[PDB]
């Protein structure tokens, strides 16, 4: 498949990007420098990841070095849940731009459908451990995102972790000005997402697959959880193709017309993960990988489950 996918804003998005959640601030600058040197042109970021300044150092250095031009990079960030207020969205976006050393983002996402009480804490809790909601809804937050396009701060806007009904809510918004370009969701062989992907793709929304390797470094991992990278069935498909299991896990979403954003801070893995354009999984391989679905989610969070807009069940 082509290396870039056309979005419904008329721009092209690289189907392979570098993830940055959990990338330590003392390692992520080098990770991003290496990624750009070996061909990555898409970086997935977020304010809540606490490392945008260090990501930005790498981007700016590579632009200064003229390794790449700004127009050839596709930089994505996300509006955190404590900034779903009319009067906070622009400043949140601007702080991300300032940190990343950019004058625009290629894509800005509503990180989660849920608004939380504004303040210093990213997860404000009540005295019993429940997240404290904001009363601001996804439609008003979307209107605020639309303003960012109209102010030139972002070239595209989208959503992340929106369920079917939430995507539909946006699409049915009275007075909708810009459709979401992307819905970024968890997707891998244990959470194959056939239903939500078909819905989004049928509406011209591009899906980005996060945690494609099963996020083995997620801080809440438990020793007994399933492991994609260690699954002997996936290893066998990889061996057949003379590729690594990670390479199969990255190529899988690409052949479903998804964008995919594996994270690494290991230079050799960053390079490995990019070497996914010179082989093909068969249809039988694809169906076989799909058959491993078990509705197993990396990203979920008990403290947020009573929020009215919590997306999962
Ligand atoms: N929108 C959202 O709500 C959301 C949620 C989750 C994730 N995301 C985005 O999606 C990105 C990817 O997801 P993720 O970080 O959860 O996990 P992931 O990409 O599925 O897995 C990352 C883990 O896999 C390891 N790894 C990477 N390449 C490997 C290879 N070739 N062989 C073996 N191990 C390898 C990494 O180790 P090393 O780094 O030590 O090499 C790290 O421990 C995130 O970083 C973030 O940008 C977004
Ligand atoms: O959300 C992400 O991108 C990855 O996960 C996290 C990253 C950081 Cl830096 C901190 C915490 C998470 C994290 O806990 N994410 C899960 C999450 C969050 C919000 C909601 Br409404 C539901 C939910 F499942
Ligand atoms: Br949420």
Swiss-Prot record:
The record marks 78 as: Lowers pKa of active site Tyr. Its EC number is 1.1.1.21, 1.1.1.300, 1.1.1.372, 1.1.1.54. GO terms for molecular function: aldose reductase (NADPH) activity; all-trans-retinol dehydrogenase (NADP+) activity; allyl-alcohol dehydrogenase activity; electron transfer activity; glyceraldehyde oxidoreductase activity; glycerol dehydrogenase (NADP+) activity; L-glucuronate reductase activity; prostaglandin H2 endoperoxidase reductase activity. It is found in: Cytoplasm. It catalyses: an alditol + NADP(+) = an aldose + NADPH + H(+); all-trans-retinol + NADP(+) = all-trans-retinal + NADPH + H(+); 9-cis-retinol + NADP(+) = 9-cis-retinal + NADPH + H(+); 13-cis-retinol + NADP(+) = 13-cis-retinal + NADPH + H(+). InterPro entries: AKR, Aldo/ket_reductase_CS, NADP_OxRdtase_dom, NADP_OxRdtase_dom_sf. NADP(+) binds at residues 10-19, 211-273. PROSITE patterns: ALDOKETO_REDUCTASE_1, ALDOKETO_REDUCTASE_2, ALDOKETO_REDUCTASE_3. The modification N-acetylalanine is found at residue 2. Changing residue 111 to N: Reduced glyceraldehyde oxidoreductase activity. Changing residue 78 to M: Reduced glyceraldehyde oxidoreductase activity. Transmembrane segments: none annotated. The active site is at 49 (proton donor). Pfam families: Aldo_ket_red (PF00248). GO terms for biological process: C21-steroid hormone biosynthetic process; carbohydrate metabolic process; cellular hyperosmotic salinity response; daunorubicin metabolic process; doxorubicin metabolic process; epithelial cell maturation; fructose biosynthetic process; metanephric collecting duct development. Highly expressed in embryonic epithelial cells (EUE) in response to osmotic stress. The keyword Oxidoreductase applies. Its main location: cytoplasm. Cys-299 may regulate the kinetic and inhibition properties of the enzyme, but does not participate in catalysis. Tolrestat inhibits retinal reduction. The modification Phosphoserine is found at residue 3. Keywords: Acetylation, Cytoplasm, Lipid metabolism, NADP, Oxidoreductase, Phosphoprotein. The keyword Ion transport does not apply. Monomer. Belongs to the aldo/keto reductase family. Catalyzes the NADPH-dependent reduction of a wide variety of carbonyl-containing compounds to their corresponding alcohols. Displays enzymatic activity towards endogenous metabolites such as aromatic and aliphatic aldehydes, ketones, monosacharides, bile acids and xenobiotics substrates. Key enzyme in the polyol pathway, catalyzes reduction of glucose to sorbitol during hyperglycemia. Reduces steroids and their derivatives and prostaglandins. Displays low enzymatic activity toward all-trans-retinal, 9-cis-retinal, and 13-cis-retinal. This is Aldo-keto reductase family 1 member B1. It comes from Homo sapiens. The lineage of its organism: Eukaryota, Metazoa, Chordata, Craniata, Vertebrata.
């Amino acid at each position: 498949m082509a290396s870039r996918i056309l979005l419904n804003n008329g721009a092209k998005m690289p189907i392979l990007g570098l993830g940055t959640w959990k990338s330590p601030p003392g390692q992520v600058t080098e990770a991003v420098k290496v990624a750009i040197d070996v061909g990555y042109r898409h970086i997935d970021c977020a304010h809540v990841y606490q490392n945008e300044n260090e990501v930005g150092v790498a981007i700016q250095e590579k632009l200064r070095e003229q390794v790449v031009k700004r127009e050839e990079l596709f930089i994505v960030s996300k509006l955190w849940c404590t900034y779903h207020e009319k009067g906070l969205v622009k400043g949140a976006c601007q702080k991300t731009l300032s940190d990343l050393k950019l004058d625009y983002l290629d894509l800005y996402l509503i990180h989660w459908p849920c608004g939380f009480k504004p303040g210093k804490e990213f997860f404000p809790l009540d005295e019993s451990g429940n997240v404290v909601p904001s009363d601001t809804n996804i439609l008003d937050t979307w209107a605020a995102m639309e303003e960012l396009v109209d102010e030139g701060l972002v070239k595209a806007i989208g959503i992340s972790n929106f369920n079917h009904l939430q995507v539909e809510m946006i699409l049915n918004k009275p007075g909708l000005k810009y459709k979401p370009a992307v819905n970024q969701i968890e997707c891998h062989p244990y959470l194959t997402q056939e239903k939500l992907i078909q819905y989004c793709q049928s509406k011209g929304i591009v899906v980005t697959a996060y945690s494609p390797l099963g996020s083995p470094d997620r801080p809440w991992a438990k020793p007994e959880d399933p492991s994609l990278l260690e699954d002997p069935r996936i290893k066998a498909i990889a061996a057949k193709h003379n590729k690594t299991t990670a390479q199969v896990l990255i190529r899988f979403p690409m052949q479903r017309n998804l964008v995919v954003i594996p994270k690494s801070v290991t230079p050799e893995r960053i390079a490995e993960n990019f070497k996914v354009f010179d082989f093909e999984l068969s249809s039988q391989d694809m169906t076989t990988l799909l058959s491993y679905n078990r509705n197993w989610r990396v990203c979920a969070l008990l403290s947020c489950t009573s929020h009215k807009d919590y997306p999962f069940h």
